[PDB]
Amino acid sequence: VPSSEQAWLEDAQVFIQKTLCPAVKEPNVQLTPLVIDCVKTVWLSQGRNQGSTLPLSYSFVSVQDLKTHQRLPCCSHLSWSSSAYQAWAQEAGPNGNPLPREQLLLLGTLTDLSADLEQECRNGSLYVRDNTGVLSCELIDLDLSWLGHLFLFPRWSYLPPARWNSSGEGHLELWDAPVPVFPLVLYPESASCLLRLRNKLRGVQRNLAGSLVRLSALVKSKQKAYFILSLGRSHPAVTHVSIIVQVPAQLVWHRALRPGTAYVLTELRVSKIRGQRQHVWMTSQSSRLLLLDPESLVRYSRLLSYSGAVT
Amino acid sequence: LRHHQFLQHSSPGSPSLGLQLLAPTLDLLAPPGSPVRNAHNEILEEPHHCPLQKYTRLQTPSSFPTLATLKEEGQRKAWASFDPKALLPLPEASYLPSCQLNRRLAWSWLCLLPSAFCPAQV
Amino acid sequence: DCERFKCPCPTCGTENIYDNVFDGSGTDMEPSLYRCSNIDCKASPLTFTVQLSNKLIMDIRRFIKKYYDGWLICEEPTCRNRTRHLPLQFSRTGPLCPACMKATLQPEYSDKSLYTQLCFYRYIFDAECALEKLTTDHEKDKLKKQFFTPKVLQDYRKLKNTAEQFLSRSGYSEVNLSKLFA
């Protein structure tokens, strides 16, 4: 086995014990051969190829090194031959070169942050840590039990920067659920009159729950960065309830909260709005939930839903 | 004028020109007076007079065409408008020797405005 | 192999020919009806749509004139007779010359021509198509930004409409299926 196939066969001797695991302490044995075999496991699951136990196409490079070596994007799945890969670029539109196939087995250390900063520059959202690269990666959906570990994916999308001096720096696109190869209250309608009066439900932090029905975006600021969500139950019930979220360890929930879905949360503070008699609740730092006529110049618009495509 | 400098976030110390260049538009069309729209007053308070929800007729103030654009444009409009006959009407139309007439009628002028243009180009 | 469109200038006295919508070269390309060809003169024939209209009809109304009066000509490349009094005998290909009794006879302005020519007209007045078929983004956007008003478009639309309706009036684009599958 010369250097060609030794490229893979060295992962049992150099790669995984050095780049895919924290080298601050001992090189885990639960990870190197486990991924060594799991790659062929998910390969031979379908395995359309000619038959080559070495998936030559993929490797591992720290997340903030693509911008040093692959100054271009990378999006792949498993087992696509060059032809079958060339047989996916139409489903909706081929306008412009399709995402490149710089093929790797995307493995990153999951953290609710990226850098060595914890309070001001907090991102909340889940991003990747490695041994020679620490980057952001665009999520899709969040449950709550994947903080502080390492996760791998054969399906993935990446993007190199525009000007490392400018805003447009690199990132990743995450397609599927977090896959680690490691050996692994006040309902809205049922509490419709609690803070409806100020005299009853102010001061301390109380738990709540309900189905998210009306959620806006999450705004930053100089000091008070937050968002305010609204919830309830099914459609023949027009009343909602509202919570607020203003914590660096809680932007995670605007990254996690979704309409049509329901939640059960604890440790949610009150709101005391200055000069405004509009008391409703917020969350706070120590909380964790789980999943549950010329006047017609100016006129007032209406509201409707849709779901379309970037065009 | 380099693009990013002309497109930086304007302020004395880094002022772009589009910051101001639209000044007559900027001012004659929409003066200020309504305080900020806040999450209390967009997502929370009802009723809210938020501007986005309001849809309003709005006529056209202007546009900044190309120098050449106007040049050829005027050229064409005028040249086409070149009625030979209505230059001199009856009866002296038939009261000149074939020399003096073509002599006196070989020249013309005209001028035009932005007002005749929708919008009022500048 | 059809006959082009010739055109009289209303002011400069010169003549013109209108082959393809665009007038020639690539990024330079310009609409046909824009400027009289003669370099110096600066009149712009577009502003005489209606006059063009006239000639259009006053031209087509001789092509049809030919066909319904269609000549008849001989085939055996020696005989070369020209007449209209259609004789009555017949054979595989059709009728037979009276003199060269060993040969067919052919129409002169074969209908295929007539319809071809009317397509040729309707071609160069319907710029919209040729505009859509154009590849390069920036060329398209720039030219449209330049000089495709509703007005110019509308004038093309007008004359093209005259042509197209005047052929589709009734001759040839139809194929009566109700007699084709009985």
Added chain:
Amino acid sequence: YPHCLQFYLQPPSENISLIEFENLAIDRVKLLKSVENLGVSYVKGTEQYQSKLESELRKLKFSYRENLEDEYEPRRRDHISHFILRLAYCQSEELRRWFIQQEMDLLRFRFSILPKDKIQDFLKDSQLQFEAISDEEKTLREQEIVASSPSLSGLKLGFESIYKIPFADALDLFRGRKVYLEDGFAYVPLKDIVAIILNEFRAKLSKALALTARSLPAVQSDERLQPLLNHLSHSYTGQDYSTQGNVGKISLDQIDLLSTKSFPPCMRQLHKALRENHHLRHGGRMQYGLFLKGIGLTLEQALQFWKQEFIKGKMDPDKFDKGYSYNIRHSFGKEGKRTDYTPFSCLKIILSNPPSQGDYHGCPFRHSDPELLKQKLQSYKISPGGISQILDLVKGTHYQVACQKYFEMIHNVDDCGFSLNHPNQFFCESQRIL
């Protein structure tokens, strides 16, 4: 996916545009030829065989989502397409065969994707007995269904909407002892449903087909429909891709160098031949000649090339002017239009132009006799397994795919990228990969 899937019937007596007529003609013929090719390439159930077709078919306007009664666009296109091509193939058994066989397999595929409820309900709309069981009977009759027939394995039979039948049309599902019986209302998996549908379809379809062929003379009194009167399978392609004056500019010297890696067997061998002989017959050059316009070199340059290859082989340096070079030049003149003013397409170097003794113009894969050709091709340093699997298709008298597999091998790339139809397109590709 669309309503389209339907059993052809009732010619739609509208009246339409002549342009749209020939359009639909060409479109549908393209679809047919393609489906045939795509099919003979792979095996049926492979997902290439799906992906590629569901790409092409959707591309040519025949399968989209829900719309109005029948004047939805693609279903109408399918409709008039068929009920025209009906007029195409009414003049052979081989022809009518090929047409049937192809439409058959298409309908099979194009139908195999409908949602199950849509499947059963549209079967209902088709004829009477086309009705479904209640899945309770799956539990009630698992023993009967499974133990009865060997056309099902174990207990894991999926939630297929099995069907009630009259035995009177079960005429092979039961006599072969392949189904349970409830008073002739046997219950059979969907597979044989597709089978029987397709068989009755073939029957009824042929039964209709023969009729028009017995009622031709009408068209004989028109000539607008002269191509499709009897002129489809001939020397026009889909269309003129590798037509006059496409991408290319290369100097003379390089030609030979490129030859060894870029000339489709026909050309390549002819160029070797003229490299040796330096003389050619009356017709021969008139293939190679126009083929050169494929890359499109200038006449005086091409004239110079031919001059070199002429007088070095002792062709009188005065004849050249008033002889060969004369017509070689005219090959870009006034008349030649669609006769000379065009390159050639394999379906002109196959379906006609018989090649005679010791001459070279003409499709090797056709005219070259089998085992002489075996050694001949092998002389291109080819693995004999490829040569064998090639000669197989060659005696299958479908050759374009043979040229294809050859190129596939000699450049080792495991996709043909296209479905070849013209040697110059082959050339433009071979230069693309460089």
